[PDB]
């Protein structure tokens, strides 16, 4: 409706501006300047690179929401691929940060080599390669249609069964497995933090561990809080498709608008890192 037609571009432009500025600033600060580059800093640099690469493609979606899509099949496929790559890489970089914190806290003296290896070599194989290999459906199914009076850029499957399958696989790979890893690591970490009198053997090491662990906790909580309502909406939509939830057409329209507004709001995860750096780094 017209309400969405005016609401979506405004939020998209605000997010694009804030994400461009913040991610560019973070990348510039941690790149050529060569400022503090601990393992968490490396992981957040990877995260900022991914977030900026996705934020680059927001004006196309704003223009698609407002008027039409004059860009083409190649650009449709490119923006879908970039979206998928960002969506997987961000959450799995968060999982890698969680695992690194667990290794640094629980095994504080014998984990230097495993942490260095995990942050140097295993990170690419565990984050980027599966994300790239999961973009094959984006390369196959992303297309530009010719509906009435305008073009549409969206993934086109033979039927809704593929939609349900890809929604479920997105839910899994982006919420459960990294969620399970983060849950286990942070449960162990918090059990160790509130019971051990002094981590490692000196007070400075203990306070450093706490001061580096806390912002990661805040970032992970904010990330999942942003993404959760969209996941609830798509779960309800999938169950509607799976014939479990049977109601009238007004119900379907309501959940559709709910999902649209919620995904527009949950795209704010791209701005968490610069804002966290700003109000925890001054």
């Amino acid at each position: 409706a017209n309400f969405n037609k005016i609401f979506l571009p405004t939020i998209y432009s605000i997010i694009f501006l804030t994400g461009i500025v913040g991610n560019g600033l973070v990348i510039l600060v941690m790149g050529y300047q060569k400022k503090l580059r601990s393992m968490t800093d490396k992981y957040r640099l990877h995260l900022s690179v991914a977030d900026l690469l996705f934020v680059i493609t927001l004006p196309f979606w704003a223009v698609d929401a407002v008027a039409n899509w004059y860009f083409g099949n190649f650009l449709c496929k490119a923006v879908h691929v970039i979206y998928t790559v960002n969506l997987y890489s961000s959450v799995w970089i968060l999982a890698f940060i969680s695992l690194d914190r667990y290794l640094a806290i629980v095994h504080a003296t014998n984990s230097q080599r495993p942490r260095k290896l995990l942050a140097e070599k295993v990170v690419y194989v565990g984050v980027w390669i599966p994300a790239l290999l999961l973009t094959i459906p984006d390369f196959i199914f992303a297309n530009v249609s010719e509906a009435d009076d305008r073009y549409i850029c969206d993934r086109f499957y033979p039927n809704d069964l593929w939609v349900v399958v890809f929604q479920f696989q997105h839910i899994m790979v982006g919420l459960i497995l990294p969620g399970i890893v983060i849950l286990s690591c942070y449960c162990i970490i918090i059990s160790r933090l509130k019971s051990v009198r002094l981590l490692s053997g000196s007070r400075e090491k203990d306070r450093n561990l706490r001061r580096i662990t806390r912002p990661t906790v805040i970032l992970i909580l904010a990330f999942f809080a942003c993404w959760l309502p969209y996941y609830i909406g798509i779960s309800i939509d999938s169950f509607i498709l799976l014939e479990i939830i049977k109601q009238g057409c007004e119900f379907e329209n309501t959940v559709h608008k709910w999902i649209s507004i919620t995904e527009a709001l949950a795209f704010f995860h791209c701005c968490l890192n610069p804002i966290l750096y700003a109000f925890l780094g001054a």
């Epitope: 509130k194 009198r197 002094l198 007070r203 203990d206 662990t213």
Partner: nanobody
Framework: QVQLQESGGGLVQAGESLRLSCAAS????????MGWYRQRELVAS???????KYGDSVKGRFTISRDNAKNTVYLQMSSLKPEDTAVYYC???????????????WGQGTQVTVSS
């Protein structure tokens, strides 16, 4: 912040028994170590797990106690000696939050007088 108060001192007849008290109140998340100090040699010290570490000249005569629910450390004095007349300082190690460092606190100071 936290507040530690000491009580139990005063003038008592020789050969009697006393029980010093030290209760901590304030923003306390967890307490790790407590002990009485008198360099200030730790004449007594009990950890959170009860692993007491008595002094050489105080072992076998003094008994320490700690009730975590009551947030107190009790030192029982028996078999008085002339060298035991001194000032007792209550010490405790606390942490105000999960992400905070290991904070250290001290007591007011208790005067115990025994005839020599």
């Amino acid at each position: 912040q936290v507040q530690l108060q000491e009580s139990g001192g005063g003038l008592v007849q020789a050969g009697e028994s006393l029980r010093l008290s030290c209760a901590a109140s304030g923003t306390i998340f967890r307490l790790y170590d407590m002990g009485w100090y008198r360099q200030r040699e730790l004449v007594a010290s009990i950890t959170s797990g009860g692993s007491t570490k008595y002094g050489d000249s105080v072992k076998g005569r003094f008994t320490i106690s700690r009730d975590n629910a009551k947030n107190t450390v009790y030192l029982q004095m028996s078999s008085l000696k002339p060298e035991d007349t001194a000032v007792y300082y209550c010490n405790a190690e606390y942490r105000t939050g999960i992400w905070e460092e290991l904070l250290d606190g001290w007591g007011q100071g208790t005067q115990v007088t025994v005839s020599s």
